[PDB]
Design a protein around this ligand. Sequence first.
Ligand SMILES: *C(=O)[C@H](CCSC)NC=O
Ligand SMILES: [K+]
Ligand SMILES: [K+]
Ligand SMILES: [K+]
Ligand SMILES: [K+]
Ligand SMILES: [K+]
Ligand SMILES: [K+]
Ligand SMILES: [Mg+2]
Ligand SMILES: [Mg+2]
Ligand SMILES: [Mg+2]
Ligand SMILES: [Mg+2]
Ligand SMILES: [Mg+2]
Ligand SMILES: [Mg+2]
Ligand SMILES: [Mg+2]
Lengths: 70, 98
Amino acid sequence: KNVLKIRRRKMNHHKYRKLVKKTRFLRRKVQEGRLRRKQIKFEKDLRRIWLKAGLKEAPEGWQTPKIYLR
Amino acid sequence: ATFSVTEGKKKVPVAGCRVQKGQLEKQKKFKLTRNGHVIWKGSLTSLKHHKDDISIVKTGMDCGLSLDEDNMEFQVGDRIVCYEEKQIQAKTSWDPGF
RNA sequence: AGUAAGGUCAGCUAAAUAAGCUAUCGGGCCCAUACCCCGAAAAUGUUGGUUAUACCCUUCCCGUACUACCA
RNA sequence: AUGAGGUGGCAAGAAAUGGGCUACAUUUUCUACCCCAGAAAACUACGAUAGCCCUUAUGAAACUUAAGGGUCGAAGGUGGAUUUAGCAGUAAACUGAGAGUAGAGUGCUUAGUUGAACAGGGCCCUGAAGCGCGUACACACCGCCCGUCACCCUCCUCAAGUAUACUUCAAAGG
RNA sequence: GGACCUGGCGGUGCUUCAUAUCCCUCUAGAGGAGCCUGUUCUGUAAUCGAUAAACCCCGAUCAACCUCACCACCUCUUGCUCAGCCU
Ligand SMILES: *C(=O)[C@H](CCSC)NC=O
Ligand SMILES: [K+]
Ligand SMILES: [K+]
Ligand SMILES: [K+]
Ligand SMILES: [K+]
Ligand SMILES: [K+]
Ligand SMILES: [K+]
Ligand SMILES: [Mg+2]
Ligand SMILES: [Mg+2]
Ligand SMILES: [Mg+2]
Ligand SMILES: [Mg+2]
Ligand SMILES: [Mg+2]
Ligand SMILES: [Mg+2]
Ligand SMILES: [Mg+2]
């Protein structure tokens, strides 16, 4: 048996790891802004539950936590 | 008269000119004229008079003129005509007969 | 322009015996082209004096560093 | 006329390269002889089959081809990298003949003379044979094949700001 | 694409070899000089072919004219050939 199918995957992974090291600073900016829309979409779903249940404001003593942080 | 000035370790050819008719302005574009031929078309790199930079020299004022193009050769009798360029709306030449 | 320090083969480095290594040229090696191996070319910026010899002195040329100086 | 015939004519040499001939001499040079000799011997030596001049031969035709004579007396002083051939009457050296031509070669074919040395020890290299292994080659290792960097073409994704469009609401309360 | 076959190749292994042979070893040479000769470049108005081993005093046991196919100029047209062509 040969490794002609591993050599195809060998370069694919090498080229992908070499591209992430070249664009690592732009990827940190995208993921940060991608986590801000993910948290705001979570805050919109919870606000839809108390607005469709007949309430006007969130239950007393409730603050939506940041579940997408470090 | 043509002068060679040494500023910043660079030899700058300076054309000494006498304004005869009209005035010269730093902004307005220039062109070099040799016995009726048009040698150059461009703007001065430095306009300096009596060791003082003057934007507008009036008629009869002496002014040294250095070009941005170093390949331009300055003679004793060359002529320089300054001009102002204004874009003008161009209308189609096509007339439809009415 | 002056003043200082300067000058090698196309470059560079030693010696003053002018050689070595690149660059260049041709040959060899190979199937052939490279690498590689061999050969040849290439002068001490110039004037003389000066000495084994130019490394000393001087003439002139060029550039380097700095300044005078100039629209 | 891409056919046929006639006249004249070129086939050179800055350079590089292959093969060969002759030499750089004293185991030689010249002469006599054909192997008991005498001379020579470094700027009048060894050494050109080249150059130049003349003559001759062949031929209708010769600075031109060949031979000979005369003049001339160069480089060269044993050859870098590398490389060729040869196991015996061989290599090496010497001599002759022939084919073909009107004539023409330092070339070719061929006959003969004198007459060697090493021959043994090894397995990188060149190459072979036997048994094996491996192989993505098969235009077959001058094979096949992997990435960076280009025009052109095709699709996708990310994405700042903004704009448009769509969806939902009363499935409610007073 | 997987697994085989053959063949080629291998800077593949073992073993045994090479007798003028791969290397060392014996002998004369080549490359150095001049000449002769061929080829390649260049040149010229002015052939062709061979062209790593397996071309290169090779076709040529051979070019002053002829040979000759080449070039330039001139000439001919059922043409030595019931044509012709070294295209
Ligand atoms: C330069 O200084 C200029 C030269 C004139 S030559 C007639 N004169 C005045 O500015
Ligand atoms: K030879
Ligand atoms: K002799
Ligand atoms: K590529
Ligand atoms: K095989
Ligand atoms: K020799
Ligand atoms: K020779
Ligand atoms: Mg890939
Ligand atoms: Mg003599
Ligand atoms: Mg003679
Ligand atoms: Mg004849
Ligand atoms: Mg030929
Ligand atoms: Mg003729
Ligand atoms: Mg013909």
